[model samples]
Target chain A: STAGKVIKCKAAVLWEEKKPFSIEEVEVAPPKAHEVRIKMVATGICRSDDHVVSGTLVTPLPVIAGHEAAGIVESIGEGVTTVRPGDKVIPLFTPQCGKCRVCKHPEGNFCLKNDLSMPRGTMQDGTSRFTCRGKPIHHFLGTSTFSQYTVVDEISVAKIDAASPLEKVCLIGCGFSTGYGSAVKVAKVTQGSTCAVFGLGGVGLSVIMGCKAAGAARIIGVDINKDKFAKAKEVGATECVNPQDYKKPIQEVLTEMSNGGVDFSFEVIGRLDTMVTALSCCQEAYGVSVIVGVPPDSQNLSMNPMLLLSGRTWKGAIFGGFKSKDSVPKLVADFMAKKFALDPLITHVLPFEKINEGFDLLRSGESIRTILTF
Target chain B: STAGKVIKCKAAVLWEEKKPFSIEEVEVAPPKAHEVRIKMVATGICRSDDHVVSGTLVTPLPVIAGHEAAGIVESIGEGVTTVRPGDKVIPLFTPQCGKCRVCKHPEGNFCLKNDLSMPRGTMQDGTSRFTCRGKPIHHFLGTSTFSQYTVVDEISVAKIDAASPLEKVCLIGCGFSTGYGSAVKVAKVTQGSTCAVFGLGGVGLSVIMGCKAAGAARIIGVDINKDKFAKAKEVGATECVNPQDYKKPIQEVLTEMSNGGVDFSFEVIGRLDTMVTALSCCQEAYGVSVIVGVPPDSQNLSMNPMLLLSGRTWKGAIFGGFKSKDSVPKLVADFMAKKFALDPLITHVLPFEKINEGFDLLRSGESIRTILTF
Candidate 1:
């Protein structure tokens, strides 16, 4: 049993920002009090992880960067009561410390225990559970799921259905859930409403699916890459538009096509330009624009307040505004019940050794979601 | 009748930006098609009017600038069907052409025909209805209640209960409704929620009233003026804060005071600094910051998208997201029913000839609202 012993495991670590992940044999310490150790079954390559590799989204160095993964709780530390050994679980980058003010609020889903705003790159106790080359490595978003063995706080782990397939469900930990919940919960895309989804990546497609499930009459897929149109259409996008085809601004084109503007718009591309465009493309009076992508931390969004002054709402969410520990289980159940298909989002599955290749595919926009299995 | 005859009347005309209002004898042309002529009774001097006088908020030159007023329909033009002669009316700055997509949408309120975005400064037929010194005068917000007699598009008029007092209910046209409805309709300030209102002016005080009516547990009033605190508290502000009292930013002070942040915040001061401060003062997760104040048209709002990315919502509304024609009558009825008090909002009263004095009262922050009677 790996309960009290340090487990030697292979983890893809980033030594520096804008550097390739180096697969190294790392020593993962056992879960401390209020923490749980997990053996990852599958992890997904998400754009946010790539943001770290591209040096746009800053995080601490020598970090295990994967956040989207499904795994089994190999062991639990003292005071860890939520999950037990052998339980199938998913690690949440946004944690649910139930005692916090936000976690206790009815409508709030961003937990106070999250590391997203200020990255400590450590466990709640202010220490790393990972070490490589005898030097302690930083945790990314407190999940660090690129490692075969990872330690997470109890509040950041969600126990899922026992019969669930980890490979497809891993996407639920971030990409699928972030996009899907953004539409279903954050924007609450209304029935018979019009929607415009910017960027045809996995999360954007998930937003389309959410829009469809919410009974949207029209879902317009927006992407510069024409190659993603077919898949976008297959996964609930009614029509697709390429910005390259329009001489005018994309927002202007969309505003004209929609006869004014869409009821709901989403920015899943993580570009400040697209974020502003998404906010502008929505109907001026009572339209909602949700930001689903993580933009570079250094960048600031600038726009005229008139954009909002006409009754437009601009909002965003982490983990699609899901209370991770609570919602992830229900999401997994819905996937298990065939309420939604997850297979379509997964374009490739690779062995853990080929994790870098999976990220390459994601960077090239050649894959919707690439699942790396151990 | 005088339905098709031009009327010589007194009107406050701004010949240029940063200039004081010039009361001049102007020729008010008869309403053309789909228009109604209204003889003003009582008008509330709003900050937006001063925005034109101070050259902060721009409108077309040689414009009559007053929007918050109650009047009686003097005459109707061709195709005018909503109201008739002698009907008590309120002119909507934000019109509701019921045929427009936004006007027809259940949630939308900003009509496509309104000239708020691109000010035409003229009637729907693209011609001024008033001429001063042989020059065609421009209209402000299509209402121009500063004029003793004004011509407005039929869609811009709301027929109110004849028994309602024009002097008191006139506040319902802009300040009362803008702030009250911002809390009630736009933010939908939930019961037991905490709210922060910046700039304890007429609109800000009205927001406090709405928050109180909505059952907000804590209504914190924020302003630089300590003198306004008493009136603010009288209007249901639980606590009053002066930014001058503390050295740290008001947002930081507010964040600490409210434990984390306010559930809802209103920016009633049109300054760009206060708008951003109001946004920053709200809770990061599930907090709603509404921009009820009209900022300068030329200025742009710049901030980190991370502010919204963490589940906060940023939105603004003209007329507090009210479909003016549909909501004004109901609001007037509520005011008549004594559902809420508008008396505390009006701190001064002036004769129409003392219009400049009313502007002085507002500029000095000595009066919450000044009612100008002709």
Candidate 2:
């Protein structure tokens, strides 16, 4: 009767806590007001999604898994002005309403409305559009792009140039933006500044790219796995270290490399030990440690009060401090302008049916990002 | 032989760790180059000295305890052009050599040379002037005002009007400066800002005075003793709280009193619980918790990283962030000008023979500050 009836879409759903995601058929509703129906062309398997799967990050079970996505906008709801029918767009995991207090503020990258809702597994209006076996399932980070087709609020989608590879651009929505923004926006890495970034996964490598873009004089990458060192160097890391090899304190190593200590340090692994090390490895005056990793809920951070007295700061950043409304389009433009390399960072591509295999690759540390094509 | 003779002076000495101080006649050497020999008039008992007595603050034993004192300059050494003989002055715990890097820095209160030497129980040249039976005895905090006659660097003495009460003015050297600086310099309590100061002791009361001088609209004082509330109000506290009466969390009590969290909070008590409470009981954005109290080495503070992410900062203020060479003189001038009330905070006075009694009163919490006069 209608142009496109209710569609049965295959998706990977986390049915219970600590259980592997199961593939199931779910029914998707048509686009509503200021909403867009996306035929997900590609999605990326991210470690953050795995955090939800492992119950480390408490989220509603039986929810769709993937978040980093790019696809063709199949239809637009009434009053939708951002993206139109048949437009190719990237899915933003967090939506910026463009008028919230945090959005208007220069320093805050978190979308208060969307971020507050995602944890509760509901939309802004306190309802879920997802349904499994005729029962309502919750949305995952608003996009829920593990399925073939997904519906999202119009503000949650950013239209990119049709020429850019959809699979590659999918990584930008979350992983790349998170890492790059941590260095560029959160840390505001200055020219000639020495920097050290911990963790050499997707986010860590992107942080390396950001440091390079900001003209940092020396970029040091620290990781436990030696295999990640070469890739880290290829991206932007001027030096690499397996922190396990050091017999002395980590601060001694960092101080030796940077003359004093790094001007900025990033904590991407999110453990208490790395957090303290990252903070201590900064220069005495105006050294800042930006926390980009989400550690376990039970863990807490402790530091000597003398550190703050010496003029060092430890701050946490969310979403790389990326303002979706402004930064998303600018990031795509930068990609078009050849200012950033999004293609090289994407290491794996798989069909939509192999989304679980992509997750396996991510768990095995064999891939930076695994793009799932529909 | 010369115009000034080496005087045999009675000095209070901590001969061993956690032992009662003993008085012994010690010989004071004449002033050296850029130094002054002072005939001590009055000295104030400071808590830091108590820490040294209790063996909490590590320092050389056979050390003299008092640092805050007002006295007459008996003689001036060669190259000492700042002050001449018979000039009345207050002994500064920290010396301000204007040529040093920290002295030149606009925002730093630290005098690098003086701070480094004070901890070692010696002068900048790593020597001591006090001798017991011709054997060298260390001076505490570079002043050693517990002795009847003490030799100090000329830079450590501030000339004051001989008309002011010497016994009363001696307290300004440490306690008043620490409290006033915490408000005026460290907290920078803005006009019309709401402030909450924990503890109603000498430092806490001075914070109230300093905040009032800075035009703070509301000043709340917290202490375990309700008897201090009336005095706190007279000195500029608009409201007072007895911690025992309020069974609720301090954060809740403060939020209710200020309509939200206060603009600034100060921890004058070094208890770790209070330190954590001080940090949490301020508005997240632009609120700063100034730590004026030095926590015991055994106690460590724990805080949720999320609180820092919300824009709150925890900072420690050394000597109220006073640059001794600059702030000490200005604070003395302000006291003379009646800009702050330092006289009212001195609750008791004792003779040199009753110096141990003053320490007893301090331990029993019966007096805010007890002045020991020679």
- Best candidate per TM-score, number? 1
Clashing pairs in 1: none
Candidate 1 chain A worst ten-residue window by lDDT: A53-62
Q: B257-373 in candidate 2: lDDT tens per residue?
A: 876578788888767788778888876534667777756654557776655544455666566777675665566676678766666788888888787888888878888888888
TM-scores for all candidates: the values are 0.98, 0.80
C-alpha DockQ of every model: 0.86, 0.26
Candidate 1 positional error at A268, Å: 0.3
Model 1 chain B lowest lDDT segment of ten: B53-62
User: TM-scores for chain B, in order?
Assistant: 0.98, 0.94
- Candidate 1 regions with alpha-carbon error over 4 angstroms: none
- CAPRI-style grade of the A/B interface in model 2: acceptable
Summing lDDT over every window of 10 consecutive residues in candidate 2 chain A, give the lowest-scoring window: A109-118
